Amino acid sequence: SMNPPPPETSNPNKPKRQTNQLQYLLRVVLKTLWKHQFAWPFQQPVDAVKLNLPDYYKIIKTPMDMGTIKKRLENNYYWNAQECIQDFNTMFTNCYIYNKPGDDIVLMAEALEKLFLQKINELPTEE
Numbered sequence: 001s002m003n004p005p006p007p008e009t010s011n012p013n014k015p016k017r018q019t020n021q022l023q024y025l026l027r028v029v030l031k032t033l034w035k036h037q038f039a040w041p042f043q044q045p046v047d048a049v050k051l052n053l054p055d056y057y058k059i060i061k062t063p064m065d066m067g068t069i070k071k072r073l074e075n076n077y078y079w080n081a082q083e084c085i086q087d088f089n090t091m092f093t094n095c096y097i098y099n100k101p102g103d104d105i106v107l108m109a110e111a112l113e114k115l116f117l118q119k120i121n122e123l124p125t126e127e
């Protein structure tokens with residue numbers, strides 16, 4: 001195959017904002033998920049060439065990963081928390097679409113998602 005370029009993480013033409021919810025998403029949510037024992041397959045874009053998955057980007061047209069999310073948060077790429085939450089959800093969904101239920105990678109994603117939802121429930125209120 002060829003891998004696609006990774007998702008954009010910095011846009012000089014996109015307005016930037018720093019809020020307590022976005023700060024929480026970086027300093028608590030991203031941080032906590034990153035350190036999970038099953039996080040590492042989700043820490044960078046899927047290298048479908050290295051993994052020998054010629055159909056990966058035929059099926060997954062909206063790829064997302066936590067390396068990308070980390071950079072977007074760092075670069076104040078998001079205007080609001082929902083845009084970031086959507087990226088996490090896209091990452092999980094992508095795993096559940098490409099892989100069979102019960103597969104080891106799916107069980108890993110499910111562990112991360114449970115933790116994610118726990119942290120999102122404790123999202124601070126704005127301002």
Ligand SMILES: Cc1cnc(Nc2ccc(OCCN3CCCC3)cc2)nc1Nc1cccc(S(=O)(=O)NC(C)(C)C)c1
Binds near residue numbers: 042046051053094
């Ligand atoms: C985010 C993500 C979503 N889906 C997948 N699916 C997937 C990945 C690789 C696959 O290859 C199957 C056969 N090989 C697996 C290792 C020996 C040969 C089959 C399916 N992988 C993902 N990431 C991933 C990243 C790095 C390594 C691997 S892995 O192939 O080592 N799979 C685990 C053992 C981590 C479950 C997987």
